[PDB]
A paper describes a structure:
Besides the crRNA-[name] complementarity, DNA recognition by [name] requires a protospacer adjacent motif ([name]), a specific DNA sequence located downstream of the target sequence. We thus concluded that, unlike the other [name] orthologs, CdCas9 recognizes the promiscuous NNRHHHY [name], with a preference for adenine at the fourth to sixth [name] nucleotides.
Since we failed to obtain diffraction-quality crystals, we crystallized a CdCas9-∆HNH variant, in which the HNH domain (residues 498–663) is replaced by a GGGSGG linker, as in the case of CjCas99. We determined the crystal structure of CdCas9-∆HNH in complex with a 112-nt [name] (a 20-nt guide sequence), a 28-nt [name] strand, and an 8-nt [name] strand (the GGGTAAT [name]), at 2.9 Å resolution. In the present structure, the [name] duplex is bound between the WED and PI domains, where the GGGTAAT [name] is recognized by multiple residues in the PI domain. While the nucleobases of dT4*–dA6* in the non-target strand do not form direct contacts with the protein, the nucleobases of dA(−4)–dT(−6) in the target strand are located in the vicinity of a hydrophobic patch formed by Phe1011, Lys1015, Pro1043, and Leu1046.
Numbering used by the authors: -1 to 184, 189 to 275, 289 to 304, 339 to 436, 440 to 497, 667 to 700, 709 to 749, 771 to 1084
The structure:
Amino acid sequence: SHMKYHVGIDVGTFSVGLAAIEVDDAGMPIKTLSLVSHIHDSGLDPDEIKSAVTRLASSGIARRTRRLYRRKRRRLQQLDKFIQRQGWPVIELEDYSDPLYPWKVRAELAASYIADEKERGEKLSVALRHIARHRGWRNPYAKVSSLYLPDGPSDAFKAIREEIKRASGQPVPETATVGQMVTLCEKLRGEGGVLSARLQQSDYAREIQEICRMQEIGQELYRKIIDVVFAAESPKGSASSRVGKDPLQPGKNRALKASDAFQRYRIAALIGNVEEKNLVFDHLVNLTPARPPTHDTNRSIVNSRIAPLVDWWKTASALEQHAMVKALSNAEVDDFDSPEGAKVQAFFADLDDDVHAKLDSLHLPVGRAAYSEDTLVRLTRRMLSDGYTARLQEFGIEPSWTPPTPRIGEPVGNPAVDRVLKTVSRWLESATKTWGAPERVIIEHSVAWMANELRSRVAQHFASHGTTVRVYRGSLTAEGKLKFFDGVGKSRLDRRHHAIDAAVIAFTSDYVAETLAVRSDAEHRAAWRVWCQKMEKLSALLTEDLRDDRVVVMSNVRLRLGNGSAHKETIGKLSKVKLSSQLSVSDIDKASSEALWCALTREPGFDPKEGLPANPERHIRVNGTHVYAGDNIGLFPVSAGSIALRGGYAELGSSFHHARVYKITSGKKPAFAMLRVYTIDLLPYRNQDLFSVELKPQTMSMRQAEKKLRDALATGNAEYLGWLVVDDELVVDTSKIATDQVKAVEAELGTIRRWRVDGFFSPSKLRLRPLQMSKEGIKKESAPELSKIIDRPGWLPAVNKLFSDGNVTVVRRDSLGRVRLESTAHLPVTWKVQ
RNA sequence: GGAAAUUAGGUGCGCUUGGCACUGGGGUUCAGGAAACUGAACCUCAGUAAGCAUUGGCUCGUUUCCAAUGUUGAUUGCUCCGCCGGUGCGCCGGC
DNA sequence: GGGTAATG
DNA sequence: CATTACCCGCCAAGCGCACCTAATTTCC
Ligand SMILES: [Zn+2]
């Protein structure tokens, strides 16, 4: 389009004010193109009760924990295979009748020799498998070899040792293993017994060591046992995948600190910051001996006084010892592929058991450089042959060069920031592809990192079209006569003020920018006269849009199947009932599986009202498994939707993906019901349209549904009209269906016809809140009805009452806030409930 | 304003571990009982999202079974389908 | 904050 | 139908990648 306009962007803590106003050729506002107060969830996990935990954070904890249980099972499987290769038997502890049998064996093995070769191996296998389960803690980067010569007893070991001395009275504070202290007590696990059990793997390795001495087990096998019992993956190269990149040379990973490159680079940087001959002379001394810098890694390596290491350092080539640096640093992956690293790795086998612990005491510098190894070396070479100035000539980079920025929507790692970045990119792209590029983009308001990154990302994005981009401080930003919901001029309750503040921001001249912050030069005064002429012209446009309610308050919706944890974490005991018992319809709907529900509901004696009568001769098949009248079956003890899990059960919670809306034509009068679809009932149909997935009556979603809707679906009197999702926008006529507290809100604040879907409260009730309002605007002098409707729990209308007499329309919008009535791309579309 | 090296500090995540809690199997010892039995402490093993993918099986399941291995399973808010746009069939983005 | 279970 | 009480699993460890803030020397 040939229209010229300005763009104002207001960044809030949980909102984004987006504004674009058509501007005259001189600078006067003409028409408002798009006013949007975009609200976001800050990327937070809804199931974390507002402890400021994002989905990314909780996903990672679940991801790592899920792997932890897998890694723990692999260890115990490998230990059993290691025990069987030694001719020892893998005996289960439930075979022995003594519940404390593993503790007795661990104390017996650490005291005297065991005669029988069979009994000695059977009890060693019992003691080893037990220590592996509760094996204490070690530094994750410390390798197994750090335990071949275990360290002295930990502070926790000494603390527990004195604890038994007090409770038992008879102490042995000398050469006592963990097993033989505990054995004489005859409540360990928990807060009370092991006093939080802040133990160490070295303490358990010491117990294993003494067991090996008593059973005539040399170091050749003790070491091999320590390898298996204390096996663990290392977090060595865990950070190697998320390393930044060189701006000058994109494809190369950033240089690693404590490398011969960076160290020889670093001191070259300081001398340059003249004597164009004596540069290299000074550098020679600085290389090989605020304070001056040095080749810190080489100094740290030699001083270590590790006799076997120092011999390798001089004999190894510069490239060979470069691999030694990567292997010792906690940020690099050991390779075993190149010959160099294979030599370093081969050296890592022959060292004595006393050498290993000395390696962990050594500390190399940690960090990353801005450029990359090849660029690090190349500039020192060019630095040597010269006296920034040294850096310029290497790349043919025009001196004004700054490292480029990614696309606007490129995520940065912070979930709250990535919400804004992706939103601003989407809106500008929709704005650009409609009215072309803008003339000015002005951005306003820890969170300032967003605003800075926006300007940089936006400026490069619009560099071709010559668009000015500016940021301003929040205090300078704030420095009218508009009518909002709660007050005049200013408002914290009305969410439309975010777009209004963004509109004013699109018209802040830089000469006005000085005086605005100043108020909290002759030409500066000429600007103010032009400015007020624009502002007074702008004020009229927003009043109309505020009156016509053209300011759009909106948020995105989440339609994918995955949405946090799929059920509650607490597990409860199931209810077991003999099959011959009397089973009402309520009892059958509490069955722990769908197959059980089908077997019970397909019985001949089943009645849709009375259920199943007591019958000592009823026969039931569940997944080919026959169940007699004398067998127990599992039922949920609660009416809540749940799943059988880990022997017991767990409640599904608020894990609704979407809710479907039905019209029930029963002949009496058309009624409206609602089906809340659980996330779990859409798992087998992940690859389909979730809103068209045929849910079967056996699914929990169906059984938890309003009974009226269930009978209608079984007869064909329920018409699927559409689906709702959390953060969907509704238009509601509250004249006939508003509750008393809603009307009290509406009387004080005006009729509220735009509502937002915040939850699916009951199988028959919605959770709605006013779309354009925020809780922070509720003052102490306000009415208590506002806190009920806006804060908690909100308007909770019945689905049938709301849709029958509310004249409700579900409103979906595009990125510019415009109502979307039809879509070629099969995107969510506005529809009317009728 | 910005960039490099620095000293001080913060935020956000990444990786591997350590303890519990919960449910299930087992076991011992108690409390109360005349007993049958309850119930409580402990100890031990196991599960620790639901699932999805591959392989191989069964009684081959619209009551969707079993076993092994892997898992990015839960960031990226318009699922799926479709059309473009980048990217290393898939990922990201736009409608 | 969400929902369930339980009252008006 | 509307309204209200009450329910939700937690705590450590060492390290490293990213980014930001406040200062000093150069240089753009
Ligand atoms: Zn049968």
